[PDB]
């Protein structure tokens, strides 16, 4: 990928091997992507942002990307799959029965990582969450 | 449906037809600029649960408006505002379910892909001609074929 500098500098690189047209691409969505559920029930995905962000190529020289999320960011490294899905049941129907509630028990300097959904938290900041998600549901 | 692309936007095919009605010395000489990231319409599902696959278009495909053809000289490249894109886990059933009835078919989905993954896709594909839109995760299903899929995902639990 090169620079819009570095494009140009190719381009006037000529002199009438030049073409009359240039053919342009519209902008796509820029990696790494954000993805959360916080807006439940929507599935937010946003794109990131002299940018390295160009290609330049002969049309004549002419697979989709896949980007892969988990809704168990790295839990499994801790927890087994059952108490996993039973967290991300929790979580989802905390989002739908009191949206606002959910989202700041959640933000209890509270990061997500770029690759991940849900916060990083400490297996007892975990209990702790769980807890009041439980108390969010039962006050509905 | 989603917004499309504007009239501006040609695709591959209307490029390349474009290219092909110049003197073919000039053929030769075509020069394409592509900017970084995936291309939309993007196709998103949870069928390999708990992946969550996010899949973007390609510049070739049928019907990808995605093209512009401008004069040769400095190219005009306008910084703008990221996209963000909304999916939907519920796709569009609450114009005819409640909240509650689109939550409990929601998880019940997700339990039969969390127990028995590749026995759930079949379920949710009961029929040659089963699609799902574009802009959603889950099939488009009749009434009676939703009926039809939560019983076989509740009888798929079950037997596991």
Redesign the interface.
Known sequence: ?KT?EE??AL?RSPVE???????????????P?E?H?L???????????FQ?????????D???????????DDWLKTIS?YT??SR??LI??AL?VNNDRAKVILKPTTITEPHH?WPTLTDEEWIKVEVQLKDLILAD
Not at 63 to 71: A, I, S
Request: include cysteine; aromatic fraction near 10%.
């Open positions: 990928w819009a494009v140009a381009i091997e030049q073409p009359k047209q240039i053919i342009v691409t519209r902008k796509g969505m820029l990696d992507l993805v559920l807006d439940f029930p929507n599935i937010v995905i946003k794109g990131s942002e390295a962000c160009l290609k330049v190529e002969k049309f004549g002419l697979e989709p990307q896949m980007v892969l999320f988990n809704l168990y799959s996993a899905f991300l049941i989802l129907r739908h959904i």
